[PDB]
């Protein structure tokens, strides 16, 4: 059952009583391909695999996100080919390339320009802020007459160990991506690193922010439950589950 925005602080405090039992029980309850993004296969190896990406519904439209991993080098062409096919104009990346000295994602975009398969990609602008970067790319594809423009919103401030201490920076980032992504747009391609749960947190916040604005209620439990069925994009810790509540609370002031 959904929680009225007016009752959300009460709800959170009740879920925190008895040493946080309510959050623990609800998070653990989540634990015990139709929505795959289709790409036409290309002349190559008949045995070649295809990029794994899944559609996720948003509050206002179906297939609002494509959730995927940061592409391995052998999947970088299929990644940009999917961006092209889907007319994606916003990518969300929620990891540094390197965190605590460990490679979390390989750079899949040019510093200047490069060609991947039949797609030429040029970096046309970088906007660097304290907690995120906006990179603007132009794509050209052999046989096609016009550029396709893509913005990558790269959040750099997520702690390696846990959730952000305050939600304020992430909420500003989400607000920026929403304001930059037309209703005209294709799906938002979103990735982090394998098994961090950050993509799932972002998606739930994106959807619940819209639901709070439009209905004055939030239904985080059923949103996350739906997210289990759709992908390996699953909230990885009880702390993340609580943080989703703390972040929506802040956005509702
Ligand atoms: Cl294609
Ligand atoms: Cl980085």
PDB file of C-alpha atoms and ligand atoms in Angstrom:
ATOM      1  CA  UNK A   1       0.000   0.000   0.000  1.00  0.00           C
ATOM      2  CA  UNK A   2       1.352   3.474  -0.919  1.00  0.00           C
ATOM      3  CA  UNK A   3       2.472   5.955   1.732  1.00  0.00           C
ATOM      4  CA  UNK A   4       1.125   9.485   1.653  1.00  0.00           C
ATOM      5  CA  UNK A   5       3.889  12.080   1.385  1.00  0.00           C
ATOM      6  CA  UNK A   6       2.351  13.654   4.525  1.00  0.00           C
ATOM      7  CA  UNK A   7       2.945  10.331   6.409  1.00  0.00           C
ATOM      8  CA  UNK A   8       6.413   9.524   5.053  1.00  0.00           C
ATOM      9  CA  UNK A   9       8.375  10.713   8.091  1.00  0.00           C
ATOM     10  CA  UNK A  10       6.032   8.763  10.391  1.00  0.00           C
ATOM     11  CA  UNK A  11       6.479   5.736   8.112  1.00  0.00           C
ATOM     12  CA  UNK A  12      10.294   6.003   8.216  1.00  0.00           C
ATOM     13  CA  UNK A  13      10.318   6.379  11.999  1.00  0.00           C
ATOM     14  CA  UNK A  14       8.049   3.348  12.419  1.00  0.00           C
ATOM     15  CA  UNK A  15      10.323   1.353  10.090  1.00  0.00           C
ATOM     16  CA  UNK A  16      13.251   2.437  12.324  1.00  0.00           C
ATOM     17  CA  UNK A  17      11.701   1.213  15.647  1.00  0.00           C
ATOM     18  CA  UNK A  18      12.926  -2.059  17.225  1.00  0.00           C
ATOM     19  CA  UNK A  19      16.461  -1.414  15.897  1.00  0.00           C
ATOM     20  CA  UNK A  20      15.262  -0.840  12.329  1.00  0.00           C
ATOM     21  CA  UNK A  21      13.330  -4.109  12.046  1.00  0.00           C
ATOM     22  CA  UNK A  22      10.798  -2.777   9.544  1.00  0.00           C
ATOM     23  CA  UNK A  23      13.426  -1.804   6.985  1.00  0.00           C
ATOM     24  CA  UNK A  24      15.359  -5.032   7.569  1.00  0.00           C
ATOM     25  CA  UNK A  25      12.291  -7.230   7.160  1.00  0.00           C
ATOM     26  CA  UNK A  26      11.036  -5.354   4.127  1.00  0.00           C
ATOM     27  CA  UNK A  27      14.444  -5.366   2.395  1.00  0.00           C
ATOM     28  CA  UNK A  28      14.989  -9.066   3.086  1.00  0.00           C
ATOM     29  CA  UNK A  29      11.495  -9.831   1.744  1.00  0.00           C
ATOM     30  CA  UNK A  30      12.646  -8.984  -1.802  1.00  0.00           C
ATOM     31  CA  UNK A  31      14.815 -12.145  -1.772  1.00  0.00           C
ATOM     32  CA  UNK A  32      12.723 -15.293  -2.373  1.00  0.00           C
ATOM     33  CA  UNK A  33      14.323 -12.388 -21.257  1.00  0.00           C
ATOM     34  CA  UNK A  34      11.068 -10.585 -22.051  1.00  0.00           C
ATOM     35  CA  UNK A  35      12.372  -7.047 -21.470  1.00  0.00           C
ATOM     36  CA  UNK A  36      15.760  -7.399 -23.163  1.00  0.00           C
ATOM     37  CA  UNK A  37      16.673  -4.622 -25.572  1.00  0.00           C
ATOM     38  CA  UNK A  38      16.742  -6.098 -29.060  1.00  0.00           C
ATOM     39  CA  UNK A  39      19.531  -5.325 -31.544  1.00  0.00           C
ATOM     40  CA  UNK A  40      19.588  -6.908 -34.988  1.00  0.00           C
ATOM     41  CA  UNK A  41      22.777  -9.050 -35.202  1.00  0.00           C
ATOM     42  CA  UNK A  42      25.432  -7.915 -37.642  1.00  0.00           C
ATOM     43  CA  UNK A  43      27.840  -9.762 -39.913  1.00  0.00           C
ATOM     44  CA  UNK A  44      30.547 -10.899 -37.532  1.00  0.00           C
ATOM     45  CA  UNK A  45      30.924 -14.199 -35.642  1.00  0.00           C
ATOM     46  CA  UNK A  46      27.808 -16.405 -35.737  1.00  0.00           C
ATOM     47  CA  UNK A  47      28.725 -17.394 -32.156  1.00  0.00           C
ATOM     48  CA  UNK A  48      29.022 -13.768 -30.896  1.00  0.00           C
ATOM     49  CA  UNK A  49      26.988 -12.713 -27.859  1.00  0.00           C
ATOM     50  CA  UNK A  50      25.006  -9.464 -27.729  1.00  0.00           C
ATOM     51  CA  UNK A  51      25.026  -6.715 -25.098  1.00  0.00           C
ATOM     52  CA  UNK A  52      22.799  -7.430 -22.087  1.00  0.00           C
ATOM     53  CA  UNK A  53      20.440  -4.513 -21.459  1.00  0.00           C
ATOM     54  CA  UNK A  54      16.870  -4.347 -20.186  1.00  0.00           C
ATOM     55  CA  UNK A  55      14.043  -1.907 -20.436  1.00  0.00           C
ATOM     56  CA  UNK A  56      12.705  -0.524 -17.157  1.00  0.00           C
ATOM     57  CA  UNK A  57       9.438   1.418 -16.917  1.00  0.00           C
ATOM     58  CA  UNK A  58       9.291   4.977 -15.602  1.00  0.00           C
ATOM     59  CA  UNK A  59       6.446   6.754 -13.843  1.00  0.00           C
ATOM     60  CA  UNK A  60       5.183   8.500 -16.986  1.00  0.00           C
ATOM     61  CA  UNK A  61       6.161   6.052 -19.754  1.00  0.00           C
ATOM     62  CA  UNK A  62       7.120   2.455 -20.436  1.00  0.00           C
ATOM     63  CA  UNK A  63      10.745   1.709 -21.351  1.00  0.00           C
ATOM     64  CA  UNK A  64      11.887   4.950 -19.738  1.00  0.00           C
ATOM     65  CA  UNK A  65      15.309   3.441 -18.889  1.00  0.00           C
ATOM     66  CA  UNK A  66      17.645   0.927 -20.439  1.00  0.00           C
ATOM     67  CA  UNK A  67      19.652  -0.599 -17.605  1.00  0.00           C
ATOM     68  CA  UNK A  68      22.980  -2.138 -18.618  1.00  0.00           C
ATOM     69  CA  UNK A  69      26.483  -2.754 -17.299  1.00  0.00           C
ATOM     70  CA  UNK A  70      29.383  -0.515 -18.175  1.00  0.00           C
ATOM     71  CA  UNK A  71      30.338  -2.061 -21.515  1.00  0.00           C
ATOM     72  CA  UNK A  72      33.319  -4.328 -21.699  1.00  0.00           C
ATOM     73  CA  UNK A  73      35.640  -3.360 -24.564  1.00  0.00           C
ATOM     74  CA  UNK A  74      34.183  -6.094 -26.782  1.00  0.00           C
ATOM     75  CA  UNK A  75      30.693  -4.631 -26.207  1.00  0.00           C
ATOM     76  CA  UNK A  76      31.504  -0.923 -26.760  1.00  0.00           C
ATOM     77  CA  UNK A  77      30.313  -0.973 -30.392  1.00  0.00           C
ATOM     78  CA  UNK A  78      27.001  -2.681 -29.498  1.00  0.00           C
ATOM     79  CA  UNK A  79      26.530  -0.154 -26.680  1.00  0.00           C
ATOM     80  CA  UNK A  80      26.815   2.833 -29.038  1.00  0.00           C
ATOM     81  CA  UNK A  81      24.790   0.981 -31.658  1.00  0.00           C
ATOM     82  CA  UNK A  82      22.012   0.613 -29.073  1.00  0.00           C
ATOM     83  CA  UNK A  83      22.265   4.329 -28.193  1.00  0.00           C
ATOM     84  CA  UNK A  84      21.889   5.057 -31.909  1.00  0.00           C
ATOM     85  CA  UNK A  85      19.043   2.589 -32.624  1.00  0.00           C
ATOM     86  CA  UNK A  86      17.081   3.761 -29.568  1.00  0.00           C
ATOM     87  CA  UNK A  87      17.704   7.489 -30.300  1.00  0.00           C
ATOM     88  CA  UNK A  88      18.989   7.729 -26.743  1.00  0.00           C
ATOM     89  CA  UNK A  89      20.025  11.275 -25.928  1.00  0.00           C
ATOM     90  CA  UNK A  90      20.844  10.804 -22.208  1.00  0.00           C
ATOM     91  CA  UNK A  91      23.299   8.331 -20.655  1.00  0.00           C
ATOM     92  CA  UNK A  92      23.602   8.125 -16.832  1.00  0.00           C
ATOM     93  CA  UNK A  93      26.829   6.699 -15.386  1.00  0.00           C
ATOM     94  CA  UNK A  94      27.000   6.315 -11.604  1.00  0.00           C
ATOM     95  CA  UNK A  95      30.579   5.214 -10.991  1.00  0.00           C
ATOM     96  CA  UNK A  96      34.068   6.523 -11.311  1.00  0.00           C
ATOM     97  CA  UNK A  97      36.244   4.574 -13.707  1.00  0.00           C
ATOM     98  CA  UNK A  98      38.538   3.828 -10.751  1.00  0.00           C
ATOM     99  CA  UNK A  99      37.343   3.606  -7.138  1.00  0.00           C
ATOM    100  CA  UNK A 100      39.753   3.052  -4.244  1.00  0.00           C
ATOM    101  CA  UNK A 101      42.348   2.109  -6.869  1.00  0.00           C
ATOM    102  CA  UNK A 102      40.184  -0.635  -8.462  1.00  0.00           C
ATOM    103  CA  UNK A 103      38.997  -0.424 -12.073  1.00  0.00           C
ATOM    104  CA  UNK A 104      35.205  -0.258 -11.922  1.00  0.00           C
ATOM    105  CA  UNK A 105      34.503   0.692 -15.534  1.00  0.00           C
ATOM    106  CA  UNK A 106      36.603   0.949 -18.705  1.00  0.00           C
ATOM    107  CA  UNK A 107      36.357   4.200 -20.621  1.00  0.00           C
ATOM    108  CA  UNK A 108      33.972   3.561 -23.534  1.00  0.00           C
ATOM    109  CA  UNK A 109      33.963   7.116 -24.989  1.00  0.00           C
ATOM    110  CA  UNK A 110      36.627   9.132 -26.856  1.00  0.00           C
ATOM    111  CA  UNK A 111      38.769  11.853 -25.363  1.00  0.00           C
ATOM    112  CA  UNK A 112      38.527  13.559 -28.748  1.00  0.00           C
ATOM    113  CA  UNK A 113      37.135  11.321 -31.464  1.00  0.00           C
ATOM    114  CA  UNK A 114      37.201   7.665 -32.359  1.00  0.00           C
ATOM    115  CA  UNK A 115      35.395   5.171 -34.581  1.00  0.00           C
ATOM    116  CA  UNK A 116      33.702   2.084 -33.171  1.00  0.00           C
ATOM    117  CA  UNK A 117      32.562  -0.238 -35.917  1.00  0.00           C
ATOM    118  CA  UNK A 118      30.650   2.006 -38.345  1.00  0.00           C
ATOM    119  CA  UNK A 119      29.982   4.783 -35.759  1.00  0.00           C
ATOM    120  CA  UNK A 120      32.245   7.820 -35.379  1.00  0.00           C
ATOM    121  CA  UNK A 121      31.968   9.533 -31.981  1.00  0.00           C
ATOM    122  CA  UNK A 122      33.233  13.022 -31.203  1.00  0.00           C
ATOM    123  CA  UNK A 123      33.416  14.662 -27.796  1.00  0.00           C
ATOM    124  CA  UNK A 124      32.071  18.149 -28.405  1.00  0.00           C
ATOM    125  CA  UNK A 125      31.763  19.520 -24.857  1.00  0.00           C
ATOM    126  CA  UNK A 126      32.734  18.694 -21.272  1.00  0.00           C
ATOM    127  CA  UNK A 127      31.082  20.436 -18.306  1.00  0.00           C
ATOM    128  CA  UNK A 128      32.816  19.493 -15.038  1.00  0.00           C
ATOM    129  CA  UNK A 129      31.087  20.087 -11.697  1.00  0.00           C
ATOM    130  CA  UNK A 130      31.988  19.141  -8.120  1.00  0.00           C
ATOM    131  CA  UNK A 131      29.916  15.931  -8.074  1.00  0.00           C
ATOM    132  CA  UNK A 132      29.316  15.117 -11.753  1.00  0.00           C
ATOM    133  CA  UNK A 133      30.419  15.699 -15.328  1.00  0.00           C
ATOM    134  CA  UNK A 134      28.288  16.331 -18.404  1.00  0.00           C
ATOM    135  CA  UNK A 135      29.878  15.116 -21.657  1.00  0.00           C
ATOM    136  CA  UNK A 136      28.228  15.942 -24.991  1.00  0.00           C
ATOM    137  CA  UNK A 137      28.926  13.611 -27.916  1.00  0.00           C
ATOM    138  CA  UNK A 138      28.096  13.725 -31.589  1.00  0.00           C
ATOM    139  CA  UNK A 139      27.610  10.375 -33.348  1.00  0.00           C
ATOM    140  CA  UNK A 140      27.988   9.835 -37.098  1.00  0.00           C
ATOM    141  CA  UNK A 141      27.153   6.517 -38.704  1.00  0.00           C
ATOM    142  CA  UNK A 142      28.171   5.248 -42.129  1.00  0.00           C
ATOM    143  CA  UNK A 143      25.270   5.597 -44.560  1.00  0.00           C
ATOM    144  CA  UNK A 144      23.443   8.199 -42.430  1.00  0.00           C
ATOM    145  CA  UNK A 145      23.412  11.901 -43.277  1.00  0.00           C
ATOM    146  CA  UNK A 146      23.109  13.636 -39.871  1.00  0.00           C
ATOM    147  CA  UNK A 147      24.674  13.681 -36.418  1.00  0.00           C
ATOM    148  CA  UNK A 148      23.015  12.149 -33.388  1.00  0.00           C
ATOM    149  CA  UNK A 149      23.631  14.048 -30.145  1.00  0.00           C
ATOM    150  CA  UNK A 150      24.034  12.280 -26.751  1.00  0.00           C
ATOM    151  CA  UNK A 151      24.706  13.756 -23.298  1.00  0.00           C
ATOM    152  CA  UNK A 152      26.404  11.572 -20.692  1.00  0.00           C
ATOM    153  CA  UNK A 153      25.641  12.542 -17.064  1.00  0.00           C
ATOM    154  CA  UNK A 154      28.497  10.997 -15.076  1.00  0.00           C
ATOM    155  CA  UNK A 155      27.984  11.096 -11.300  1.00  0.00           C
ATOM    156  CA  UNK A 156      31.392  10.937  -9.599  1.00  0.00           C
ATOM    157  CA  UNK A 157      30.490  11.493  -5.904  1.00  0.00           C
ATOM    158  CA  UNK A 158      28.954   8.152  -4.825  1.00  0.00           C
ATOM    159  CA  UNK A 159      31.075   6.766  -1.932  1.00  0.00           C
ATOM    160  CA  UNK A 160      32.897   3.500  -2.672  1.00  0.00           C
ATOM    161  CA  UNK A 161      31.847   2.055   0.699  1.00  0.00           C
ATOM    162  CA  UNK A 162      28.170   2.931   1.065  1.00  0.00           C
ATOM    163  CA  UNK A 163      25.430   5.449   0.401  1.00  0.00           C
ATOM    164  CA  UNK A 164      25.983   9.199   0.179  1.00  0.00           C
ATOM    165  CA  UNK A 165      25.887  10.872   3.595  1.00  0.00           C
ATOM    166  CA  UNK A 166      23.405  13.474   2.299  1.00  0.00           C
ATOM    167  CA  UNK A 167      21.054  12.929  -0.585  1.00  0.00           C
ATOM    168  CA  UNK A 168      21.268  16.606  -1.659  1.00  0.00           C
ATOM    169  CA  UNK A 169      23.920  16.157  -4.366  1.00  0.00           C
ATOM    170  CA  UNK A 170      22.350  13.075  -5.941  1.00  0.00           C
ATOM    171  CA  UNK A 171      18.913  14.712  -5.942  1.00  0.00           C
ATOM    172  CA  UNK A 172      20.378  17.750  -7.757  1.00  0.00           C
ATOM    173  CA  UNK A 173      21.957  15.353 -10.265  1.00  0.00           C
ATOM    174  CA  UNK A 174      18.643  13.537 -10.835  1.00  0.00           C
ATOM    175  CA  UNK A 175      16.903  16.916 -11.234  1.00  0.00           C
ATOM    176  CA  UNK A 176      19.516  17.903 -13.840  1.00  0.00           C
ATOM    177  CA  UNK A 177      19.005  14.691 -15.868  1.00  0.00           C
ATOM    178  CA  UNK A 178      15.218  15.085 -15.750  1.00  0.00           C
ATOM    179  CA  UNK A 179      15.421  18.743 -16.895  1.00  0.00           C
ATOM    180  CA  UNK A 180      17.863  17.752 -19.709  1.00  0.00           C
ATOM    181  CA  UNK A 181      15.873  14.802 -21.067  1.00  0.00           C
ATOM    182  CA  UNK A 182      12.895  15.787 -23.236  1.00  0.00           C
ATOM    183  CA  UNK A 183       9.679  13.783 -23.265  1.00  0.00           C
ATOM    184  CA  UNK A 184      10.640  13.588 -26.994  1.00  0.00           C
ATOM    185  CA  UNK A 185      13.733  11.536 -26.022  1.00  0.00           C
ATOM    186  CA  UNK A 186      14.467   7.861 -26.334  1.00  0.00           C
ATOM    187  CA  UNK A 187      15.159   5.773 -23.213  1.00  0.00           C
ATOM    188  CA  UNK A 188      17.757   6.900 -20.689  1.00  0.00           C
ATOM    189  CA  UNK A 189      20.667   4.433 -20.819  1.00  0.00           C
ATOM    190  CA  UNK A 190      21.889   3.935 -17.259  1.00  0.00           C
ATOM    191  CA  UNK A 191      24.756   1.935 -15.861  1.00  0.00           C
ATOM    192  CA  UNK A 192      27.075   1.780 -12.881  1.00  0.00           C
ATOM    193  CA  UNK A 193      29.377  -1.091 -12.103  1.00  0.00           C
ATOM    194  CA  UNK A 194      28.432  -4.716 -11.563  1.00  0.00           C
ATOM    195  CA  UNK A 195      26.703  -5.304  -8.230  1.00  0.00           C
ATOM    196  CA  UNK A 196      26.798  -1.818  -6.744  1.00  0.00           C
ATOM    197  CA  UNK A 197      22.980  -1.272  -6.744  1.00  0.00           C
ATOM    198  CA  UNK A 198      23.447   2.412  -7.645  1.00  0.00           C
ATOM    199  CA  UNK A 199      21.496   2.100 -10.907  1.00  0.00           C
ATOM    200  CA  UNK A 200      18.538   0.628  -9.009  1.00  0.00           C
ATOM    201  CA  UNK A 201      18.662   3.446  -6.446  1.00  0.00           C
ATOM    202  CA  UNK A 202      18.692   6.032  -9.209  1.00  0.00           C
ATOM    203  CA  UNK A 203      15.772   4.443 -11.062  1.00  0.00           C
ATOM    204  CA  UNK A 204      13.627   4.142  -7.922  1.00  0.00           C
ATOM    205  CA  UNK A 205      14.336   7.799  -7.000  1.00  0.00           C
ATOM    206  CA  UNK A 206      13.531   8.971 -10.532  1.00  0.00           C
ATOM    207  CA  UNK A 207      10.172   7.191 -10.477  1.00  0.00           C
ATOM    208  CA  UNK A 208       9.206   8.020  -6.873  1.00  0.00           C
ATOM    209  CA  UNK A 209      10.044  11.712  -7.378  1.00  0.00           C
ATOM    210  CA  UNK A 210       7.504  11.767 -10.222  1.00  0.00           C
ATOM    211  CA  UNK A 211       4.904   9.861  -8.215  1.00  0.00           C
ATOM    212  CA  UNK A 212       5.261  12.229  -5.229  1.00  0.00           C
ATOM    213  CA  UNK A 213       4.881  15.253  -7.497  1.00  0.00           C
ATOM    214  CA  UNK A 214       1.888  13.882  -9.405  1.00  0.00           C
ATOM    215  CA  UNK A 215      -0.016  11.916  -6.708  1.00  0.00           C
ATOM    216  CA  UNK A 216       1.357  13.057  -3.318  1.00  0.00           C
ATOM    217  CA  UNK A 217       2.105   9.447  -2.393  1.00  0.00           C
ATOM    218  CA  UNK A 218       5.137   7.210  -2.751  1.00  0.00           C
ATOM    219  CA  UNK A 219       5.265   3.412  -3.079  1.00  0.00           C
ATOM    220  CA  UNK A 220       8.946   2.535  -2.688  1.00  0.00           C
ATOM    221  CA  UNK A 221       8.266  -1.076  -1.680  1.00  0.00           C
ATOM    222  CA  UNK A 222       6.364  -2.013  -4.827  1.00  0.00           C
ATOM    223  CA  UNK A 223       8.746   0.006  -7.020  1.00  0.00           C
ATOM    224  CA  UNK A 224      11.747  -1.962  -5.755  1.00  0.00           C
ATOM    225  CA  UNK A 225       9.763  -5.221  -5.960  1.00  0.00           C
ATOM    226  CA  UNK A 226       9.030  -4.519  -9.642  1.00  0.00           C
ATOM    227  CA  UNK A 227      12.748  -3.783 -10.107  1.00  0.00           C
ATOM    228  CA  UNK A 228      13.653  -7.334  -8.923  1.00  0.00           C
ATOM    229  CA  UNK A 229      11.576  -8.877 -11.713  1.00  0.00           C
ATOM    230  CA  UNK A 230      13.166  -6.756 -14.465  1.00  0.00           C
ATOM    231  CA  UNK A 231      16.956  -7.004 -14.076  1.00  0.00           C
ATOM    232  CA  UNK A 232      20.049  -7.739 -12.008  1.00  0.00           C
ATOM    233  CA  UNK A 233      19.733  -3.994 -11.258  1.00  0.00           C
ATOM    234  CA  UNK A 234      18.756  -4.805  -7.688  1.00  0.00           C
ATOM    235  CA  UNK A 235      19.220  -2.694  -4.546  1.00  0.00           C
ATOM    236  CA  UNK A 236      22.316  -4.286  -3.041  1.00  0.00           C
ATOM    237  CA  UNK A 237      22.055  -3.381   0.679  1.00  0.00           C
ATOM    238  CA  UNK A 238      19.569  -2.549   3.405  1.00  0.00           C
ATOM    239  CA  UNK A 239      21.468   0.739   3.792  1.00  0.00           C
ATOM    240  CA  UNK A 240      20.633   1.672   0.178  1.00  0.00           C
ATOM    241  CA  UNK A 241      17.005   0.793   0.768  1.00  0.00           C
ATOM    242  CA  UNK A 242      16.913   3.161   3.761  1.00  0.00           C
ATOM    243  CA  UNK A 243      18.795   5.846   1.845  1.00  0.00           C
ATOM    244  CA  UNK A 244      16.099   5.752  -0.874  1.00  0.00           C
ATOM    245  CA  UNK A 245      13.583   6.666   1.827  1.00  0.00           C
ATOM    246  CA  UNK A 246      15.814   9.412   3.268  1.00  0.00           C
ATOM    247  CA  UNK A 247      16.347  10.906  -0.193  1.00  0.00           C
ATOM    248  CA  UNK A 248      12.632  10.988  -1.101  1.00  0.00           C
ATOM    249  CA  UNK A 249      11.914  12.555   2.298  1.00  0.00           C
ATOM    250  CA  UNK A 250      14.386  15.349   1.501  1.00  0.00           C
ATOM    251  CA  UNK A 251      12.888  15.910  -1.969  1.00  0.00           C
ATOM    252  CA  UNK A 252       9.376  16.203  -0.479  1.00  0.00           C
ATOM    253  CA  UNK A 253      10.185  19.255   1.718  1.00  0.00           C
TER     254      UNK A 253
HETATM  255 CL1  LIG B   1      21.990  -1.400 -35.694  1.00  0.00          CL
HETATM  256 CL1  LIG B   2      36.016   8.843 -13.277  1.00  0.00          CL
END
